Symmetry: C2
Subunit: 619 residues, 2 copies
């Protein structure tokens, strides 16, 4: 930031300078004939330095008589603003050893103005990492009384916005001749809005809209003087056409010909992305939708300590995903609404005061049951301290809509991983994949449904003489079946082997992309049926469970009874309770299992946001 101002030996030169900015001083054309030395003097508050044009260092210049040298340069800096027009002046006298009087004088009158646009940097760049800085802008997609109005007709809406301060110290008469403009690119204008305060902090009409869809420039009138306040709100989440950076500029113009800019200052905001929460984080609220299932959900939520929302609106986990957007001023949860259409339930009953709304309509096999996220991992040499997004798809060669894929990919904080779920009838990730908190290892355990685990369990209990134990025994009458009938069913075993191979492909992809080992994976017994189509749960799917910290709700599998207790439940306990978890089995055969869904496919959860702040993610 350097501005060259040249002076004249025949007349004084007048210049307006910004505080802190260095000004190099030179002249138009040659020095007096016999010039051998020079002196330079400055008004109090004006710093003058001598420096070789090749040297990084500076040196005070108003204390000596310097031998003339065209390779030297004088720098003038004023850290404080002026009080009147032409407050200060710099005087350069040219001396010789022939006559005792100065050969000539060069006078530069200076008016210092302090103009700077600033925000909370937590001026021209936004950097990731532990050494990061920059303003973070929320989207404000909630209802406090919001992202649609052109006014600020609310009392706590400003708590979601970001503050911007324009310091405009200086003499008042200067602004009779100069002009201040706050502007932004029309592209950035179509992505955020700003409001200028006039009736400070009391009335909602005080905040007047000055930059928006049509407005790309606003002349700040300096109502308060030497300082103006602006409240900025983002209008768009990052997507395939929006990198996520919004820059605002302030310009001082010398107003003949036209207005000409003399100084420009910038503030660059980054739009905070949408973040998902895995089942490993502590829960906040349980959401549920005849039903002797809400009773068990309420009991388990009370045992876990979470409020519950009941809805008579007729699959609450397929329609919406509960995430959050975090900023240093406020971190509010935001709901993503699935393109499947409970189509009105998010917009109506979920948009609380601090609860934002985002959705992507493609105008459809994909729902937010197929949308999950892993715990923090380390893989491919990189770190993912907020986990990675897990979605469904096919192998290279039935995919989620491209709008949702681009939206998830563009958040940059949880790099998504595509899996193989096409082989399933409905096609949700939570049909074969789940996560659970573990007190050892990598802090968690990945639960995968394995037909081979059911093979091992049934064969082991059959070698003891319990092959005549009946599955689906204690249900409302569908067709009871024994262990010997299942193990000797050739087609069922072959199809479950195919399912196991699909889940093995997904297992290897998971171990690769999440950097997990075998000691972190737990195989849960689960068999699958087929009606000349894709795969559905034979007995209630166990991995499709709700996980609230220490308490997990698992669908009652109604497996073969050996000692008066379902041995599938005993295997689930022997696999999960060593991790300290409490296994509560819910009767989920009458309301949901016949309709291709389980508890996790009928119960949604909000979680505590991550402790790791996303600006340090270093994507």
């Amino acid at each position: 930031l350097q501005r060259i101002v040249r002076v004249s030996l025949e007349h004084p030169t007048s210049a307006v300078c910004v505080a802190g900015v260095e000004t190099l001083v030179d002249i138009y054309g040659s020095v007096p004939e016999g010039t051998e030395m020079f002196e330079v003097y400055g008004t109090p508050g004006v710093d003058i330095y001598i420096s070789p044009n090749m040297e990084r260092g500076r040196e005070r210049a108003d204390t000596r008589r310097w031998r003339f040298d065209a390779t030297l340069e004088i720098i003038v800096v004023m850290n404080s603003p002026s009080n009147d027009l032409n407050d200060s002046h710099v005087q350069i006298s040219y001396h010789s050893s022939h006559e005792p009087l100065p050969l000539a004088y060069a006078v530069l009158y200076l008016t210092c103005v302090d103009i700077s646009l600033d925000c909370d940097l937590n001026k021209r760049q936004w950097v990731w990492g532990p050494s990061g800085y920059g303003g973070i802008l929320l989207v404000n997609c909630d209802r406090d009384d919001d992202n649609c109005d052109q006014h600020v007709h609310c009392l706590q809406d400003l708590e979601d916005m970001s503050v911007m301060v324009l310091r405009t110290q200086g003499p008042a008469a200067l602004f009779d001749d100069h002009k201040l403009v706050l502007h932004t690119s029309s592209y950035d204008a179509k992505r955020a809005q700003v409001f200028h305060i006039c009736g400070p902090e009391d009335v909602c009409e005080a905040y007047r809209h000055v930059l928006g869809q049509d407005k790309v420039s606003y002349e700040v009138p300096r109502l308060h003087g030497d300082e103006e306040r602006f409240f900025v709100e983002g209008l768009s989440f990052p997507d395939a056409g929006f990198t996520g950076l919004i820059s605002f500029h302030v310009t001082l113009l010398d107003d003949d010909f036209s207005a000409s800019p003399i100084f420009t200052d910038t503030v660059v905001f980054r739009v905070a992305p949408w973040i998902m929460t895995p089942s490993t984080l502590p829960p906040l609220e349980v959401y549920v939708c005849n039903t002797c299932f809400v009773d068990a959900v309420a009991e388990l939520a009370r045992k876990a300590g979470c409020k519950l929302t009941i809805c008579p609106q007729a699959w609450i986990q397929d329609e919406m995903e509960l995430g959050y957007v975090q900023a240093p001023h406020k971190t509010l949860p935001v709901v993503f609404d699935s393109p499947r259409n409970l189509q009105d339930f998010p917009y109506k009953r979920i948009l609380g005061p601090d609860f934002g709304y985002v959705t992507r309509e493609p105008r459809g096999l994909d729902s937010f049951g197929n949308l999950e996220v892993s715990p923090p991992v380390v893989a491919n040499g990189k770190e993912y301290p907020l986990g990675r997004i897990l979605i469904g798809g096919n192998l290279p060669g039935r995919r989620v809509t491209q709008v949702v894929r681009d939206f998830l990919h563009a958040q940059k904080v949880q790099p998504p991983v595509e899996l193989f779920v096409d082989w399933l009838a409905v096609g949700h990730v939570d049909e074969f994949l789940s996560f659970v908190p573990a007190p050892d290892g990598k802090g968690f355990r990945m639960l995968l449904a394995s037909p081979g685990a059911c093979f091992k369990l049934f064969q082991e209990k059959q070698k003891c003489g319990h092959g005549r134990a009946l599955l689906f025994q204690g249900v409302v009458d569908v067709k009871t079946i024994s262990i010997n009938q299942v193990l000797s069913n050739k087609d069922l075993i072959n199809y479950n082997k195919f399912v196991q191979s699909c889940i093995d492909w997904n297992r290897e992809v998971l171990k690769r992309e999440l950097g997990l080992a075998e000691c972190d994976i737990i195989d849960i017994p689960q068999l699958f049926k087929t009606e000349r189509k894709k795969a559905t749960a034979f007995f209630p799917d166990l991995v499709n469970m709700l996980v609230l910290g220490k308490h997990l709700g698992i669908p009652k599998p109604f497996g073969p009874i050996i000692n008066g207790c379902c041995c599938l439940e005993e295997k689930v306990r022997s696999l999960l309770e060593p991790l300290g978890l409490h296994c509560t089995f819910i009767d989920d055969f009458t309301p949901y299992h016949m309709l291709h869904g389980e508890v996790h496919a009928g119960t949604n959860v909000c979680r505590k946001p991550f402790s790791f702040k996303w600006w340090n993610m270093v994507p």
Copy 2:
């Protein structure tokens, strides 16, 4: 690359594996009752390793009897392809200390196929830097065939056109009977398909009809028939330069499909990828050695001086009577690849005089054409230059940075299409300057570069009205104020003396304003190029004005042609003191200490009166950079 294949104790399992890919072997459930140990054996050419599932590393498994352990894993690898469908098999026997015979066997028959798609990596990433690798694809925007643009046909009407394309090899070794049951597909994304094309060879390298189009605008998949046995050749040509909507990466995939499921569907079992990067367009500054000089009624001894300087420099010369300023219409750059580095011309959106000249007379065999038509502005490729390699902002620019013109915040900027095209090359990050204050608005009106044997290897020449102030005042203090500018010119310009110029109040004030504009540009140049004062040379130059415009009072000196050691400068026709123009003497005293040879050309009638100089009427092609762009690390 790990694939789990489970086996059964009740029946043998058959599996097709790709060479080199590791396969983890396990079982479905069974684990015979009293199993305490196990052995594993493999057909010759089948490598079997034991490894704990928590610690990495391998260990040969077919030499011992291992105690059974569910926490172990067996890995099977076949580095060589099979000759028949069930060439190899892996056998796992489960043993006990109670009975001497194996409790059970698990047999896995293996068919090893060697499928790999490869190119010149100079498989899934393209990385910048001195440790970089990946395939680089040219755009082939020239006319190699002596029969007609080459990038438009769907055939290859030439014998040497393929020299611009990239080679891709599909190795498909394995038993032939396997391909009666399986299928090979070469595919690409439709987006990448709309940006490049590929040709499959049939009848190697002799006939032009051998190269048949298999992936293009409509084609996003092609079933390779394996004509040449175990390996097929493909020639790829790029169709688009990187722009605001094209990141520059084009990926091709090869997929093996298990079509044994005749009635259900085809199922993929292996995918391999090759990622190409489109080579960007590179500019050449005046510091690089020149190749050809291009020049463009009522002409004079200006083509003569251009020819003399080209002969003294050793460059070809192209004369064109095409008028109804050859440097405003086109910019001569180049695109570089390890197979061949060919020059490519960018055609400016300015049209009307030489609009057809690039497409017609510049498209040689190895001479590409790129252009971006808007839908305007005053800025054209005379306003388009590039700096020598620099270091600034902590970063290095080993092939320089692009210099274009514009205004300060508040119009007169290059059209957004050209700006996005220049911004998207990523190899010479452009810098926008302040040129709006000029009448026509070209960067070469106040900025030039010259080769210097000292310093940073070059010198930046900036026009400075203050330099002319100093020169005229110094020669006036000697008593030569009555020396006349424009003396030895063709008359009606009105002759004028030094005393008239120095005492012209409005002229001096306006030239001070021009000097302030050029000072802003000077500071921006020192910041963005990391140059100091010892590398900048101020050249005396005054300017005129018709209430709004900036034009050269006397011929603009920095608007010069620079061919290595020889530079052609417009004859300024300044005040004559000792029988020689003192402006010329100052130019010599500033440039000849850098070893350069100053040749002043009398160009006052054809160009200086029409707001242009030699560099604004002569174009040049240069030697490409020695630094290869793949190491630029943007």
